[PDB]
Amino acid sequence: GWVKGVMIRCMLNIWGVILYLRLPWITAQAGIVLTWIIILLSVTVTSITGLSISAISTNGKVKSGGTYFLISRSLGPELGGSIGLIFAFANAVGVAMHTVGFAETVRDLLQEYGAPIVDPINDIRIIGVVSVTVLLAISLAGMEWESKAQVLFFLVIMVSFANYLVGTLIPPSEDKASKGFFSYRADIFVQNLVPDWRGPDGTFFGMFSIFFPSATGILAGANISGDLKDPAIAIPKGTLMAIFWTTISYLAISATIGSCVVRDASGVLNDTVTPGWGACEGLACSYGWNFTECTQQHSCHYGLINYYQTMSMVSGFAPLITAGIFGATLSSALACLVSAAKVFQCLCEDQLYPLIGFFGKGYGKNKEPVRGYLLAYAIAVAFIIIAELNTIAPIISNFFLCSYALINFSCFHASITNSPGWRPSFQYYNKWAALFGAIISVVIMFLLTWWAALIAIGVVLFLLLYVIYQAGSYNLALSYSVGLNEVEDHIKNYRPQCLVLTGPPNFRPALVDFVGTFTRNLSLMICGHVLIGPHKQRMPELQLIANGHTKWLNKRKIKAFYSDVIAEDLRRGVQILMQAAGLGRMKPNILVVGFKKNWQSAHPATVEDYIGILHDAFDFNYGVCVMRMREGLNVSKMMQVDPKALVKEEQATTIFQSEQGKKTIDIYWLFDDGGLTLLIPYLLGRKRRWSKCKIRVFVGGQINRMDQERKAIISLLSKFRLGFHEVHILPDINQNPRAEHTKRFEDMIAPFRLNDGFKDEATVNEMRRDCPWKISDEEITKNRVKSLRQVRLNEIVLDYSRDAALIVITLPIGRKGKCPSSLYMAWLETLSQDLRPPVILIRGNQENVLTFYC
Amino acid sequence: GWVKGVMIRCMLNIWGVILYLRLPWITAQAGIVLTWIIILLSVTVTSITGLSISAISTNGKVKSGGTYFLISRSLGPELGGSIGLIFAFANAVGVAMHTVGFAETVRDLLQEYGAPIVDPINDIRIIGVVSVTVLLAISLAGMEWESKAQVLFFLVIMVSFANYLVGTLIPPSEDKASKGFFSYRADIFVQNLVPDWRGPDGTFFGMFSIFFPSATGILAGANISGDLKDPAIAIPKGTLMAIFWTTISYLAISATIGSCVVRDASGVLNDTVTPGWGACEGLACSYGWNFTECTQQHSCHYGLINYYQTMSMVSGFAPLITAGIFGATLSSALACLVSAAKVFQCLCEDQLYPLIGFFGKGYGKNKEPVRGYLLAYAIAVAFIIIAELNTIAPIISNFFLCSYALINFSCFHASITNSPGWRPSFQYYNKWAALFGAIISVVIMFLLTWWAALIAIGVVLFLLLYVIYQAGSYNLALSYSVGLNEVEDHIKNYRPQCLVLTGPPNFRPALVDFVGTFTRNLSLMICGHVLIGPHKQRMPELQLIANGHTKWLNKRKIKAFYSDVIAEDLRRGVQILMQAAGLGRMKPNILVVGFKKNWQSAHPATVEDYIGILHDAFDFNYGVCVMRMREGLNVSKMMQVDPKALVKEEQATTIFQSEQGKKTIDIYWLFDDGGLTLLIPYLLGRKRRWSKCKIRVFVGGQINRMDQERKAIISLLSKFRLGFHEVHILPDINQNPRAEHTKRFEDMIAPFRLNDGFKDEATVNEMRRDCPWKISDEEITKNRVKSLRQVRLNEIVLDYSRDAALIVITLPIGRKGKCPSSLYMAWLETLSQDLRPPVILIRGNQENVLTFYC
């Protein structure tokens, strides 16, 4: 339920050692008014944190429970992981504080009854170590008696409170009056209403740092959210009621102990007032006691400000309050230890931090964090070695204030940024109240001591930034794609979607880098390897080889999407890839095909396949490009870096980027239909390294007009962001070429004079003028026109461009049925046959433009 | 250039009041060693910040930009705005500091002539406010000549340094020796090597806070940008050289003033030691000077630790050092004043903060920040009212340390997160050096004083958090989906990428719906429509058809991509789309096929093509699935105005489409592997529609042991939440053969014997064995028992699951070369016979299981 399950659990964890041992002393040094102010200032922070905790408990629905699990699932991995670690450390030090208080009580019992062990501080150390070892032994094995222990502890604390209140009303005896107790008196109340400020810790915030661990423990209700009936209505009321009732108890005890005991008293029973004309100085003189001797010399042993166990002295039966101290300290220490271990284990099971993951495994059948229990025990022992409560308490105040500020600010952050899963139903949660609580918690943390607060904030920032440096990554790409399913065919975004042939990626990598240069974070570039084996498709050995190849490619920091194809020949192999690659609107639009360095050496029939590539690409309304670099195409000389992944020379391509380019692109327009002609040069022409480029826009501009035909391209020039009027009119585009060049063009096809790959087509010629080698207006009979033109282009490139870093060569057009594949190949070969420049071939598909950069 | 452009004006801003007024006093209170440590510790912070600033300057080619512009464009707006605000405030307070130093110098000058105004402190206030008003008047109008005033200031400071050194070289005069300066002496150097803390400000960090303004002024090099020939080379050299040379000057002045002036001296010229025995003490006694009275009485007026103007006294010509102080102060204060105003104006140009202060508005033709100038003047006057360098300097140290820590951490943040616009070219920039600089800056800021450091940090946090609080996806894909291309392969999450073959999307819409409600933002679903085109694409209008189908899909709630493949048949027709659909990881993983229910009407070729897709899916590691309906998946759409969404009638046939599933789904998963067999109804179950259907597990096979295998299944069920433990036994497959069910099958496979139309099979078979059911290790003989099992599965569909949402039977498996096509197709027809509700068959590729949803 909510009473015993939640409120009593929070009660037993909030009530602890400072309630019995230091609250009367805080009331003595700070007075009743400032002690109440301290109590209320701590309760403000803890109640604002409790409202955030209640909002967390009402957010969504969590069935397993746990403080770290609730906070992290409601607030996030970064803030949740910082909270689950600072809170775990704070709970580990709380064990040390409560065990030190229990050890101090046992030491006082030994001093009054019997003999001490070694030394009043060393006895505290020894008893604390032994008691924390016993607590660890109980936690590891023997955690089934917890309901009975909870009932016994709550009843013993109730009995201690009742006995203290009963003995306070009793009129003082000789011993109690000697020790400073005079029942209730207005004079003592008025005297103790004001501070005294003795010792090094006499300070308002010095007292706040010692009292504050009396207000912590409000997170015990959230620890068992899974093991409750209805957490959304049980955790808030239980936590808030526990905070309220413990606040009432602290205020009442402070008020009644301030009004009963004087600050200074001496245990000597002879200090009763002598019947004569004495010089009695203190307030106790009116009550018949003479405490001047020690009060003037600051050597009193008893009193509110000098005796730490005055609460037990005041009461009717000291052993009952001793049992109450034992119960409170043991319950709080056990709760802190088990909470630290369980939060740390759950935090470690979520791999958010590198090295803590070792303390994440459980033992036995219920998976107890034995490693976490041992780490918490080690931290507790280390802080127990400090045998002073007034030293441990400020540390716990700092770390619990840091944890509460973190929780409050995490709730405020989740509220202000409208976090997805952050939907609190708690009626009394306000994000500005949480922000105020976090701010005041940090301010108080720095006010108690600045260096420990700085260390805590530094650790918090380290963890938060480490984590920063059910979201999912696959579903996001899917969501963006389907959102694009509603993309507008309107303003067709003719991004340079391209399809690339490389075969194995380690071979022909010049294309890879090339189409990798541009469309970097601009569009899609798809690599394409076609396996040419028609028999035994390596279904098993396809993903693995791709993996390896993609890793190599990825090691090159490329931006592509390799693709594997099985087929019998090149033609149908790429035909499969072009019309089915991508998905929906996410489809490739441009094809680039690697040239075969050795085509005329042997294997004649491959000309058909290679030219069918281009013809089917033309018919498919794709973009088309050829690939032939300075050096040989296929890498077959290795047996004497090699993996571009390791090292990628790619000089032929890297020249443009690695080296600062001083020579420019040269294009032309003999085929005006090609719109891409102003895009592929645009794309590549606009890259970081490609920055250095004095764009030479060579175009067949109108021989008389440079302002409406050439500027027709200049008005459009703006969108292509060209900014160049370099329209170099070279009307010598197709002038009669060199005699020698035509000669070579011919005997090039002399071996292939026949349509060897076209017997069928020869029969067609046979029935049509029987043209064996010369073809009317198709080969050289009349088609020579285009051949002499293209060769003139070659002369041009070789004369004007001469040494040309790169050339935008427009692939010429041949329509099937009026020109053979042979001549087409012949044209491809003669595009750059004389030498070996880098073939930056290009041609478009009469598609619209001005997509990139307007 | 770089010298005069950067380093000369960085020195002029770094040199200021503390160089002449408090450095000797710091060397007096702290030791020479401790003063050197302070200087080097400040220079470490400023040099790390200078490295960060040099990295910022060499980032990109930002032109015509101040300090704030550079920082906010290289770094983020969130960090840039806070940096600009803190830097502007720090400069505004530095104006007050340098004006107070100038006023102190003028007040001392007035006192030495015996003409004070009102009193020491109020005279400082009056002179400082008048000076700062004159400074504001110069800054507003009359700055045109500040370009030539720079040379005068630099030459004046150089002359002051030379005069100080020359005067230090001079042997003592009677007046100078009386005032404490004798000369370079080893004894004085040794005496001043050790610290001597002699006031409220006497502490290591107390002197660090006063000195540190001597090291600030390096960002003065940053705001020059736009007036430099080459910032990427000028800014780093100038800034670092200025830091080095000013550090050298500070160290030299400290070590030379600590070696010639004693800490205690009296301006009385009669202290000269009187001859006789005496009891004279002190180091000066050895030089004939008995300063005993003041030293013991602590009433000395002169000396290093008492006189604030010791550089002036030591130097040969006092007015020259006064001129040097004037030049240094009026250069640093003017630089700070015209830096704070410009940074604030640029910051207010960016609508980054709500209360702009409107100081952003420029005046005149140069758009000078008159409003910003007045705000800076007001802040300077407010901090001038303090009129004490030892109090103003700690504030400026705090705020400049905050600014430098902010810059260093912002550079580190940009480096570690790999910001898109952060690619610094500075060779000596390291993000860990920047992190160290920011951390030590914050530590020193809190060490000097904690409350002002907390105020500055809170202001920075407030600003930062306030600022913190169409082929787009195409492009977004580049960063996410090609970021999805790089993802590990060891994730092995069996993404249920699904492929479908409904032909036209409108037709066979039931499969579309089924594959759409499932994978609704979970898995990729791709719609493949085959146009079986045997010629040139009919028209681009086909693309219109594509947009019409995508609109149809969007007219409902589908997340489909539409693609098409041109072919001449179906087997190859799907085969094209099969191994090329998708791209990289996103690629479809399983395949569903529109069942050609009509199979006894058309030639069996269609049936052979049909078995083709399933066999190919078996060879390509794909998943096979198939639906079936009573009225017709390939419903004739018989026809037996604004027609509304046919969804209503459609969903009648497609419950999943809209109707929340009510009746139970049953997985007749005779086959175990191919997890999708269960996954399909599973992520179908996740669906709210199917949340109303107990997921029935109809396992079948062995009867002797049931749960023995199940315990493996319930382990993977703990992983794949089921919520049930009752798997109904299907012993029908065995010992339960029903004759009338065999007779139908036989009468259902007649024209299907050797109807594969496989002439080669017939031939090879004919030369092996004759009869169409003789050579039957494959022909419905060895696998006949399988046909019995199939018809029994249908019978237990009619009994065990008489009614169900979808009867999920495991899709059968047939071996190529060991299972004929007609036998398999008849098996499927039995498994999905008539008079059944929607029915689905599945069989995965047994890659791995449990990968999804644990």
Residue numbers in the entry:
A (entry chain A), B (entry chain B): 137 to 605, 617 to 787, 807 to 1020
Q: What's written in the study?
A:
NCC, encoded by the SLC12A3 gene, is expressed in the distal convoluted tubule in the kidney, responsible for sodium reabsorption and playing a pivotal role in extracellular fluid volume and blood pressure control. The first branch is Na+-dependent cotransporters, composed of two Na+-K+-Cl− cotransporters, NKCC1 and NKCC2, and one Na+-Cl− cotransporter, NCC, responsible for ion import. Thiazide-sensitive NCC has been treated as the drug target for hypertension by the first-line clinic drugs, thiazide diuretics.
Here, we present the full-length structure of human NCC, with 2.9 Å for the transmembrane domain and 3.8 Å for the carboxyl-terminal domain. Full-length human NCC, with C-terminal His and Flag tags, was transiently expressed in HEK293F cells. The overall NCC reveals dimeric assembly and displays domain-swap organization. NCC adopts an inward-open conformation and a domain-swap dimeric assembly. Like other wild-type (WT) CCCs, our NCC structure is also trapped in an inward-open conformation occluded with substrate ions. The dimerization contacts of NCC mainly derive from the extensive interactions of the two CTD subunits, as described in other CCCs.
